Amino acid sequence: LSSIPTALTRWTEECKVLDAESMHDCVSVVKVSIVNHLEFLRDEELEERREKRRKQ
Amino acid sequence: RIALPAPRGSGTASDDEFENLRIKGPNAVQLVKTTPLKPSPLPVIPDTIKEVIYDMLNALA
């Protein structure tokens, strides 16, 4: 049932209790590593798409 | 995966040049798409986690 709290809501409670303001800092530190990887793969897929268009 | 917006205009000299300006531009809208589901196998539950779960089930009775 939807009354049962989801894992993200339980983790949200945990985070609040254990780190209200340091969550943002961890989001920033982890973001720096995620966005660089996803943008690298975005640029590789974009190159692949342009190449496949040219090869067509 | 950060999303790729559609090819704005066919043509590499002009359209793809300004498609790199748009998609890779400092100011952009990196929407997200998920990858296709990879077939995750079930994790084997450790025995201590089963002596934790079983003790509650015994507390039912």
From Swiss-Prot, chain B:
Tissue: Weakly expressed in heart, brain and placenta but not in other tissues. Expressed in a number of cell lines, predominantly in those from colorectal carcinomas.
Post-translational modification: Phosphorylated on tyrosine; phosphorylation is probably required for its ability to inhibit TP53 transactivation.
Modified residues (Phosphoserine): 14
Superkingdom of origin organism: Eukaryota
Annotated localization: Cytoplasm; Nucleus; Mitochondrion
Disulfide feature: none
Entry comment, domain topic: The HECT domain mediates inhibition of the transcriptional activity of p53.
Family stated for the protein in its record: Belongs to the UPL family. TOM1/PTR1 subfamily.
Reported disease: Intellectual developmental disorder, X-linked, syndromic, Turner type: An X-linked neurodevelopmental disorder with highly variable clinical manifestations. Common features consist of moderate to profound intellectual disability, delayed or absent speech, short stature with small hands and feet, and non-specific but recurrent dysmorphic facial features such as macrocephaly, microcephaly, a broad nasal tip, deep set eyes, epicanthic folds, short palpebral fissures and a short philtrum. Patients may manifest other features, such as hypotonia, seizures and delayed bone age.
Cited function: E3 ubiquitin-protein ligase which mediates ubiquitination and subsequent proteasomal degradation of target proteins. Regulates apoptosis by catalyzing the polyubiquitination and degradation of MCL1. Mediates monoubiquitination of DNA polymerase beta (POLB) at 'Lys-41', 'Lys-61' and 'Lys-81', thereby playing a role in base-excision repair. Also ubiquitinates the p53/TP53 tumor suppressor and core histones including H1, H2A, H2B, H3 and H4. Ubiquitinates MFN2 to negatively regulate mitochondrial fusion in response to decreased stearoylation of TFRC.
Complex formation: Interacts with isoform p14ARF of CDKN2A which strongly inhibits HUWE1 ubiquitin ligase activity. Interacts with MYCN, POLB and CDC6. Interacts with isoform 2 of PA2G4. Interacts with NR1D1. Interacts with AMBRA1. Interacts with HAPSTR1. Interacts with HAPSTR2. In hepatocytes, interacts with PAQR3; the interaction promotes PPARA poylubiquitination and STUB1-mediated degradation.
Designated name of the protein: E3 ubiquitin-protein ligase HUWE1
Top-level taxonomy: Eukaryota, Metazoa, Chordata, Craniata, Vertebrata
Span within the parent record: 1894 to 1954 of 4374
